[PDB]
Amino acid sequence: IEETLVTIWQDVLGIEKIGIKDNFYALGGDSIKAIQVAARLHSYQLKLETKDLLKYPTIDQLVHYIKDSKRRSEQGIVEGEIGLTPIQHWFFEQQFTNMHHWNQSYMLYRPNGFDKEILLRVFNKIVEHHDALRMIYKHHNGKIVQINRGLEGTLFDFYTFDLTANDNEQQVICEESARLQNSINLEVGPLVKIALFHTQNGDHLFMAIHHLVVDGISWRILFEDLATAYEQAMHQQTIALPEKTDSFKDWSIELEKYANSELFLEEAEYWHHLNYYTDNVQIKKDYVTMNNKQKNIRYVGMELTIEETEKLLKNVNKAYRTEINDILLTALGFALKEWADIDKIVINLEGHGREEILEQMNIARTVGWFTSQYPVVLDMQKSDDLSYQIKLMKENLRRIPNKGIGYEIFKYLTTEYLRPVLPFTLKPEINFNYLGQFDTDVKTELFTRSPYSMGNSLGPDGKNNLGPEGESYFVLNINGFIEEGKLHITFSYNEQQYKEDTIQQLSRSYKQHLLAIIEHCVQKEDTEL
Ligand SMILES: *O=P([O])([O])O[C]C([C])([C])[C]([O])C(=O)[N][C][C]C(=O)[N][C][C][S]
């Protein structure tokens, strides 16, 4: 029904009232919000191909393209060996020092406090429902063996700290959470570490999960099921989570099939264009250094106001019928041109990686590490013409098949005798990672973000996420997100490679060009057919 879409859109977009004529993207939608709509529909046994939502961005149009779900996923307990996925292959290939310490984290806050007994019940359901959290990793014969445990052993560690007497809540939270962050055992588990802090202003719920089994969308899913199960428990109802989508196991199995399929191999030809840019990869550094560890990384931050961010989310993409990636990367092109006099450069672009490339596979609600990464070429031709550059960036991104998911599939999954001959040793020095919007997911009726949280806990600059002795792998690590209605962009660099001021010039330049692109696009009316 259209009443179901209205409700879902309203929840997902964080907008109280939505008409059946409202444009999804003009309301602030993106491809991650789209997946969240698809996930909600799955619980109603309804199917949405997110690409339809792009062609029919209103409920009045889209209702005719919503189908019944033919796919039924594993609802029981998933167990057994699972082949590493592309981003997982990349991870082990790095051989990070203390790779057991390589996590994402988050901290929630509830002024009236959490009931601990309920939390224990809720997280038991969580690790049961979201099978990938029970993963372990073993070595057998110089090879990594990924194994999904059943309901055996310890599925998560949970600590309770009573700081209601301590006068230094922030220090203790940092010290204790750091200990959790450093205590993950990849061989026997658990990969999920949880601490509950009682304080004078309420409770703070800290969570650290090894990156091997989680990502940005997974966190959003966890937050939802956390609130849902908790709300049920405090109302003395049976804890009950939405239907499972496809398991990480089943996904990996089909992904490896795809990797060697005839249809996918035909894509190899496109990626040859990278061969024209192999010497457009390195940027100038202030200094040469041998010290390349996480402890040597610092960052510069920028942010827009709520008004500026609203324009970006709601009134910019209409100008050229773009998506936010087009805009952000166009701004980066200009910024790098003014900052280092660069005309062409190859970057590493991260995507959520949940592309409908596998048939009736649905992972809209699956917890795991699905992140894709791939080389993108930025080409600065006409610095004076915005219309030309934006349309150039747009076309460049559209010429990439299936959001670039295929490149690392070729690189890590395709068997040797089918593996195309591609420039696999290409290594961009710049990474771009825009995580998307989080306000609707973290700011609920049950809880909100913790004030004791330090920095972006879902990124590499998050406090205590990565082991300090671990090796850095990018010269410039650019990460972004929307928090409290404000776009944040951070620039992570090696302190012995660049002076802080050098990076500050890049950040300010990026902010300048981004705001200029916003003003340009705000003034351009929708005329794409
Ligand atoms: O295809 P889209 O919906 O347009 O992509 C959504 C974006 C704009 C947020 C895109 O930048 C993206 O996919 N970012 C994903 C980065 C990520 O998921 N990181 C996970 C933790 S490593």
Swiss-Prot record:
| Span covered, complete protein | 543 to 1071 of 1098
UniProt-recorded name of the protein: Gramicidin S synthase 1
Q: Which residues form the Carrier domain?
A: 1-70
Task: State the organism of origin.
Answer: Brevibacillus brevis (Bacillus brevis)
Instruction: Identify the domain of life.
Output: Bacteria
Keywords assigned: Antibiotic biosynthesis, ATP-binding, Isomerase, Ligase, Multifunctional enzyme, Nucleotide-binding, Phosphopantetheine, Phosphoprotein
Name of the coding gene: grsA
The similarity annotation says:
Belongs to the ATP-dependent AMP-binding enzyme family.
Q: What does this protein do?
A: In the first step of peptide synthesis this enzyme activates phenylalanine and racemizes it to the D-isomer.
> What does the subunit comment say?
Large multienzyme complex of GrsA and GrsB.
What lineage is this protein's organism placed in?
A: Bacteria, Bacillati, Bacillota, Bacilli, Bacillales
**Residues carrying O-(pantetheine 4'-phosphoryl)serine:** S31
